[model samples]
Target chain A: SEALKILNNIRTLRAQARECTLETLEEMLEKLEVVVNERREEESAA
Target chain B: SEALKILNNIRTLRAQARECTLETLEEMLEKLEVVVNERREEESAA
Candidate 1:
């Protein structure tokens, strides 16, 4: 269920990105990069 | 600002995914795919 969890986390982060200020958006972007990179990692590992 | 709007839309879709039923999750996933693919298109077009 890790993939499911990752998807859900992505969703949550996106929501956060919506309301976040530009300053906070940068933070959210960093977080998103981490999650996205994690997904890529999962893909290559499979 | 198209990219910013796309990012915000992605966030909204993700939020929807979190609370959606499995059936609805599929719908959200499809929507998410559209948004993601749009992002990819933007990247290549740039």
Candidate 2:
């Protein structure tokens, strides 16, 4: 049930709005890295 | 090795705390232009 056209439109809109600066992008990269690490440790614990 | 364990633990914690909204991320990114422009102006002046 994947609507490819709608997904492409959403992606296009997102790219248009996302004019992020380098520092903020760096911070978000850090944030996402943290998300990945925690899920890993939590799964390892379980 | 090189306080790596501490760094890892801190990253794990940050991920747990990161429930930040998209609006906040956008605001931070916007501030980057001002910072970059200000630094450039200073460099040109000096």
Candidate 3:
């Protein structure tokens, strides 16, 4: 679950009051897009 | 930011090993989508 891992990474960073650089946020967005698409496909296939 | 708040909430819940219900995850997905879209638009506008 790359999305979950990314989410955790974000959470950990934020807990320390740190902001993710634009590059990191972009990566997060990309991962989340993949996850959302996969879930959509799963729902459609079901 | 609402998105950041939601992200934090998700992190806190996960820290306790509690899974977000489907509804909560759906909310998260929606919020993330908005945030990502906003960022994309900001990039384009810049």
Highest TM-score model number: 3
Off by over 4 Å in 2: A1-18, B1-46
Please report the interface RMSD of model 2 to 1 decimal.
15.2
Worst window of 10 by summed lDDT in candidate 2 chain A: A1-10
Top candidate when judged by lDDT against the true structure? 3
Per-residue lDDT tens digits of candidate 3, residues A1-46? 3234334343443432234445545555555455455555656887
TM-score of chain A for the candidates in order shown: 0.51, 0.58, 0.55
Superposed by TM-score, candidate 2 places the C-alpha of residue B4 at a distance from the truth, in angstroms, of 28
User: Which residue pairs clash within candidate 3?
Assistant: none
Model 2, A1-46: lDDT tens per residue? 0111221233332342245333543443354345445555655787
**Residue pairs that clash (backbone atoms under 3 angstroms), model 1:** A11-B14, A14-B11
lDDT of 3 at A16: 26
Model 1 chain B is weakest, by summed lDDT over 10 consecutive residues, at B1-10
Measured on C-alpha atoms, candidate 1 has an lDDT of 0.44
Model 3 is docked with a DockQ of 0.11
Report the candidate with higher TM-score, 2 versus 3.
3
| Fraction of native contacts (fnat) of each candidate | 0.00, 0.00, 0.06
DockQ, candidate 2, comes to 0.04
The per-residue C-alpha lDDT of model 3 at residue B2 equals: 31
User: How well does candidate 1 match the true structure in TM-score terms?
Assistant: 0.32
TM-score of every candidate relative to the true structure:
0.32, 0.35, 0.43
> Could you give candidate 1's per-residue lDDT for residues B2-46 as a string of tens digits?
333444444543443445345534443444454354445655887
